[PDB]
Amino acid sequence: DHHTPLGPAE
Amino acid sequence: NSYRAALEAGNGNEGGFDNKVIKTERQGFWEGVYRRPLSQTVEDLGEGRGIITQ
Amino acid sequence: MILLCIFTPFLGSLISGFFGRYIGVNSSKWIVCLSIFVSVVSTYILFIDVIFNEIEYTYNIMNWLNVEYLVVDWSFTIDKLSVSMLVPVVTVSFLVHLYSVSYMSHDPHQQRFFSYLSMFTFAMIVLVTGDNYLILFVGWEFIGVASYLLISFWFTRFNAVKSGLSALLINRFGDALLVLGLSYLVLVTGSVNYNTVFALGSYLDVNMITVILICFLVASMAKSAQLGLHSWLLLAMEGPTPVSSLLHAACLVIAGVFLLMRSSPLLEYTPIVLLLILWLGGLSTLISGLIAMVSNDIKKIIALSTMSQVGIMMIAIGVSCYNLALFHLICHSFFKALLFMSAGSVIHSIISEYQDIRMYGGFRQFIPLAYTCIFIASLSLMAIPGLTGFYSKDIIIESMYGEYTFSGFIIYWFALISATCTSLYSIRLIYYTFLNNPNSPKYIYINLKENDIVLITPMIILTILSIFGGYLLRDIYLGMGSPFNELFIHPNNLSLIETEFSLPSILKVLPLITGLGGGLILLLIYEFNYSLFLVYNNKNLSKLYSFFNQKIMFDQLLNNLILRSGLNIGWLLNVHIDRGILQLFGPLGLWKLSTFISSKLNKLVFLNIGFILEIIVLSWLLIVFKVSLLKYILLLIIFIIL
Amino acid sequence: GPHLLREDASFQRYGQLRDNLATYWKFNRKAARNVFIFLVAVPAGLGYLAYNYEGKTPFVGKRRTEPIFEQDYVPRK
Amino acid sequence: MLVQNLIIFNIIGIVLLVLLNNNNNGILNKKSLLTIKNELKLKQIGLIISIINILIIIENWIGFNSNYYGFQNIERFLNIYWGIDGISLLLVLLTLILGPIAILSNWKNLKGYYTYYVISINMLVILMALNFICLDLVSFYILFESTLAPLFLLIGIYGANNKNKAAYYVLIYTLASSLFMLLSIVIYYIIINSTDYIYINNIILSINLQSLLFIGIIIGIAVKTPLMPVHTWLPTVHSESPLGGSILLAGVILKLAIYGVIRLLLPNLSEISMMFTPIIYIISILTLIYSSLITLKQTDLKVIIAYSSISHLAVCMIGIFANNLIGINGSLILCLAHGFVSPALFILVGGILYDRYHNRLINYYQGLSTFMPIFSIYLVVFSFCNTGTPLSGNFVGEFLSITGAVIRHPIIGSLTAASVLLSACYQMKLTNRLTGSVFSQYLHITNDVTNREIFLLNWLLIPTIIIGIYPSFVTNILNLASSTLIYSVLI
Amino acid sequence: KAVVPFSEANKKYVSSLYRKSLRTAHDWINKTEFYRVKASEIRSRFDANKHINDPNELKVIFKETEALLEDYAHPDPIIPPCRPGGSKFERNIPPRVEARIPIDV
Amino acid sequence: DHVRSPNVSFDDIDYNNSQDLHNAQESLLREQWIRVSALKVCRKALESCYKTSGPNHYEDCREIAEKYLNMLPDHRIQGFLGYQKNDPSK
Amino acid sequence: HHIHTPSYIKPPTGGWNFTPANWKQNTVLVLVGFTACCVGLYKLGEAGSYNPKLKYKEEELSRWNQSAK
Ligand SMILES: CCCCCCCCCCCCCCCCCC(=O)OC[C@H](COP(=O)(O)OCCN)OC(=O)CCCCCCCCCCCCCCCCC
């Protein structure tokens, strides 16, 4: 899995 | 050949300049003129890049 | 419609570039692909309204340069030729972006990759739709800017960095000549417009057209990568596989041809330039066919195929058949995009991601779909009768013989060998990777699968064009007497009649007979009698193989000799002039002299009556000697300094 | 500030030398070989071409008064 | 108004700054409020004066008429006649604009004595700004040489490790040569009894005396716009002077030498300018080719940009000596475009890197596009502008200058086209190295470009791309002014 | 220098010449069946002269073996993509792990 | 407003009167800028014809092409220093 | 895995698989911008473009060639 979660809100 | 000697000999710019008096011969070393015979320009620059022809 | 067709990629590149952070990876790619798709559909509408309905569009934004008589606008036009080039460009580039949505999915930087890619498409669009040469020159440079950024996209990789620099510097070599060609265009006609310069072609001196067009040819050699300025073309494979497809099928590698075709009204009035292009375009096809047969990297083989095919258009230009070179340009962009895509699919599938076709083998069943795309494209490349590359490439080979001059005869065999080698290195490429005995380990073969449906769609669509595109479009360009005045053919240069009617009956089959018939022979050797090719034992074959595998040793000649000497002259100037003679006649030298002079003068100031008294009495001699002796006393003084 | 650069002793010598080549330079027969080429040979060669053609190139709007194509054909056979 | 308001206000400002700082000296030690935050109040007053100087000229730019031939805004102040024409107006605008940017560049990277620095920067800008608006050779020379006194002290006080060598170079190179320009100015005052521009434009001199005056004046010009072989001062001074001193020494001081041709050579020495133009091309073409090749072997970061300055100025001189409007307009647009791109690079090279790592050697910097992305976008963007990419203002200047060069002399003037290729060699090699491969093992991760350094970059890039996209802003002012410089008789 | 047979260092040299020999054969020969045949021979050519107790006799072979490889060296050797010289070497290097030391510019 | 050119020649005035000399220079500059404006108009006529004629551009645009290549060398800015300081009659 | 140093490195194009949490919201704000401008570009293209083969009739050109004669 990539499992890269979203970063913060921009 | 100093400008002082030319001025004291009448070959300096004490006499002002004028457009209606064109000198066929070349002017002295220290002398200035308003207008020149075009043949003196061609005999110096040569024909070509904008003199006489394109 | 025009303004929508031109600038839509631009705002697509900006949005990925400047808002790609705020909309993430997935959306950035698709919004970019949307922008190219908008320009595709807009282009097709104009293609119908321009090619068939004899209509022209011209949007003139504003004035650019207004220096006395030299007036240049930001004017964009779409004639037959401008829209004949917007089909190969925008169509292929849209599928490349659609292909690249999935190819780059495992790459961290996909907002920057797509920002460059849509920028590259916009520059090429500006290149072909500008109404003067300067607007063309604007896009002509951002082609090199975007290519340099694309080729060196993996800037952490040392090899990709320098290959990006090699592409930019060699292209700026032609760009310098292209600028010099424009200056002689302003010098002769005071204009760079198409409506003006082409209207004055015959009335101008023949020597002047040569000066302008030789510069155009040298600039076009750089972009189209012909012999002499071609070392960079194979260095370009450091970029991602989508970059190679877009830049070697529908972009700069063809932009050299467009510049020559656009300036056809001038090119017909200086036959010397045409003759040079014929030889440069004939030698290049011969060489890159010969180099490819002994090339092992898969992308190098296809890249060398592009150089040979691009050179085929050059000889079409040389014989003044611009309609032939233009039509092959369209047909070449279709399968050659497919071949790089199919190469990308093969390399993606194999888990080791190898590129040397010497580490492949027996792939034909594990990836049947990737294999078929190469098979159909290669046959279209090899001009199998009834395909698309047949109806465009074959006529050019005939017209080399149909010229019935010395140069046409000599180039005929160089071209015919190119058709032969095309049919050969293709067979070598297909067997070594799909039919040969396996060379990769078994764990690779148990884990060999095709790729996702997003990656699959662009290839199949280009396959269909490679089966039907050439036939449908044949009469639009090669039609006997179709009105295409954008390409100007002087009446004494038309040989399409004799190309089609007078050729010997054996030549019309000669490319194909040595094409497939010679293909089987090589296929048997690669299959049944490979022992012949164990060439390391034979010193004659090893020397021959090493020479062509090292690309005519042209790369070594450039670096070891030409580039290093160029950098060495910088060193000699930096040593003997800047820190050499200029410092000797400068700070260092005058410090040495002043140290010598001042060290003498300091020794003279000392309190001593005898010294000052003696100096004074010497100076009375200046009253005795005649004044003409002063300079000798000036020299005598200078001596005693020493 | 904090000396964010790992200064290198060998790079400093290389930088010191490359900015002080004037000190070790000599006007040997090698330098005169280069000095003559760049300050005299090239300027005079270009200086001749510049003055030779200075005014001999009326290329502004130059016209053609000589046919390009050939009229009659003379076959070898 | 103009000069009177421009001098009196600046003198008042200089006096005001001196009064505030030096009040507390006295006999006792002082810990005042004006020293707090590194003389911050005194730096602000210096920055405001730079902005106000721009407002003075704009008050007079509105009145400017683009369809009038002749000097406008003529006034007499200190027994000297001033005035503005088309060419002079734009160069004045460039000079004053670099005022705030030169001060802002050195906001917090000097060890002290900020008040002295702020006064000197505003003093140098005014002296150079006034040099475009005088109307006699003597007053031209006075302003042309007065800038040495602050510049020599500024470089010596605030310079780098070799500041003593740099100070001894600018003072002597630019004085031992400009003194030759004084001789030709004096001879004008002896034979004609006046050095006024208009009075001497109408006089023709003997072709022997024209050759003497030209040789004297072009000696003083060939050093300010460094032409080989007298360029050795500029690379040294750039690599050692303070960052603000480099912005003025490259942004403006070089362009005073191209303006020297426009006033002192073309109008009054027109006949002898035709003769020297073949020779000027030889020197400039060799300057273009040699400076580009020498840059390929340099190691100091701030020297590399210094030589790139020489190659462009050689092209500017090539264009201006072309006897057509294309070359003259192109040369002047290039001077304006180079006036922003050149300072921007020194900020990138000697103002952003050098303020973080304090080393100018190229070997330490590579892969900078990894942990400093905003820096590498501007370095890439300004690398292209510095090499005449078609959308920038440099391409318009270079293309026209090359076009004008070919028009004047088709054979040798064509070699100017080597500027397009060579400028991409040393420059793109520098950028490709800086932002390529892995991040350097000698540097340490730090801040990217700060907000102040972004402001400097954005406002040196914005004027560059307006002139590129729409150069007719510059041209509409130049055309009638630049058309009075052409000497040709066609029959 | 001198060559001391049966010493550990001398064996490793012969090991290195073996990887040069077989890889070079692998570079030219692109069929496994043909490669094993030639690879078998090279080992036989490598094992026939296994027993040497003399310095000077061995050094001539080292001189000869270098010449054999140099003349037979491939002009385009096969390289794994992620190994140095490969097609994917240095691609997408993960960024360095380190603390950002802020500076008050 | 539209300022009228001060139609004045170098051959009728005294250069000592620097006010009149200024007009002789300004009048010689303005006429030349008209010729370039005349030239840019003629070139526009050529461009329409070539675009409109297509194949017939060699015929329908014959005298315009001839005239444009005739006016090009002399319909350019030349300044006044050439004619002020030189006397063609001599 | 590995560390992107995303605390400070914030280039305009994200960096190392960057995706903001509110990416769905921003895209619709962006998809409007592409739609707002593509519609806007179509208006200007229609209004400001022309056909350069119909501005002057051949009857007008035929007078030009003769007038220049
Ligand atoms: C780029 C464009 C050009 C720009 C610069 C233009 C001017 C540059 C002039 C360059 C001439 C000087 C440069 C070469 C001299 C260098 C001196 C030197 O190298 O040393 C020789 C010697 C010093 O003795 P030593 O300690 O042994 O040093 C030997 C090291 N090789 O020195 C000696 O032995 C002395 C040599 C003879 C001295 C004769 C003195 C004659 C008068 C001096 C000249 C005056 C010039 C000014 C005149 C007006 C001054 C008011």
Ligand SMILES: CCCCCCCCCCCC(=O)OC[C@H](COP(=O)(O)OCC[N+](C)(C)C)OC(=O)CCCCCCCCCCC
């Ligand atoms: C026609 C072209 C005119 C160009 C301008 C004139 C030449 C420029 C000279 C630079 C001077 C310089 O460099 O001054 C600084 C230099 C020395 O250098 P430094 O800084 O101490 O470092 C170098 C010191 N070492 C060796 C310890 C490392 O001091 C001197 O040698 C003092 C004497 C210089 C006299 C200048 C006379 C000028 C006459 C010009 C007319 C012939």
Ligand SMILES: CCCCCCCCCCCC(=O)OC[C@H](COP(=O)(O)OCC[N+](C)(C)C)OC(=O)CCCCCCCCCCC
């Ligand atoms: C437009 C032209 C106007 C004329 C200007 C004349 C300059 C005289 C100024 C004296 C004021 C003063 O001596 O004050 C000193 C001031 C400010 O020093 P500070 O940093 O605040 O104090 C420092 C000590 N602390 C911090 C401990 C308190 O620095 C200056 O002098 C800078 C300007 C002059 C430098 C160059 C002079 C060259 C003169 C020749 C020019 C052709």
Ligand SMILES: CCCCCCCCCCCC(=O)OC[C@H](COP(=O)(O)OCC[N+](C)(C)C)OC(=O)CCCCCCCCCCC
């Ligand atoms: C016709 C005019 C078209 C202009 C449109 C501009 C679109 C492209 C914007 C790119 C911004 C960006 O993001 O560049 C910065 C990228 C971002 O890297 P990332 O992928 O976000 O990963 C982030 C993590 N890094 C950085 C470690 C990989 O890194 C760089 O510093 C790359 C080097 C500088 C690139 C300069 C490109 C500038 C474009 C050319 C200007 C003429």
